[PDB]
Curated annotation (Swiss-Prot):
Belongs to the thioredoxin family. The keyword Disulfide bond applies. Disulfide bonds join 39-42. Signal peptide: none annotated. The active site is at residues 39, 42. GO terms for molecular function: protein-disulfide reductase activity. This is Thioredoxin.
Length: 115
């Protein structure tokens, strides 16, 4: 009765190594969900990540996803050891990591890096 939501979030697929370098290369912090089709917990936490992209943090931090099976070069450079893993980048460097389907840890890290 008050308003309808107008979603403004953007979870974007990273489909190449060049794109990966471009989006992780600047001052704007980005967070990447490293996932795979055979990953069970990814299905629990993925929707959470998508909802967080719609929050005002999504205006400050870029939200992306990388399919580890399809993006071996990216996955090997980043050093993925578990799935899902959420990795934060700034200026071409890894600045934080959240392993697994942990919604409170994921939110805490997003809030930390969107200040």
């Amino acid at each position: 009765h008050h308003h309808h939501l107008v979603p403004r979030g953007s979870v974007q697929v990273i489909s190449s190594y060049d794109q990966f370098k471009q989006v992780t290369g600047g001052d704007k912090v980005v967070v990447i969900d490293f996932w795979a089709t055979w990953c069970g917990p990814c299905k629990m936490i993925g929707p959470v990540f998508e909802k967080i992209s719609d929050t005002p943090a999504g205006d400050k931090v870029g939200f992306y996803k990388v399919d580890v099976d399809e993006q071996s070069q990216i996955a090997q450079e980043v050093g993925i050891r578990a799935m899902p893993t959420f990795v934060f980048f700034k200026n071409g460097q890894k600045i934080d990591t959240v392993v697994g389907a942990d919604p409170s840890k994921l939110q805490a890290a997003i809030t930390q890096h969107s200040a």
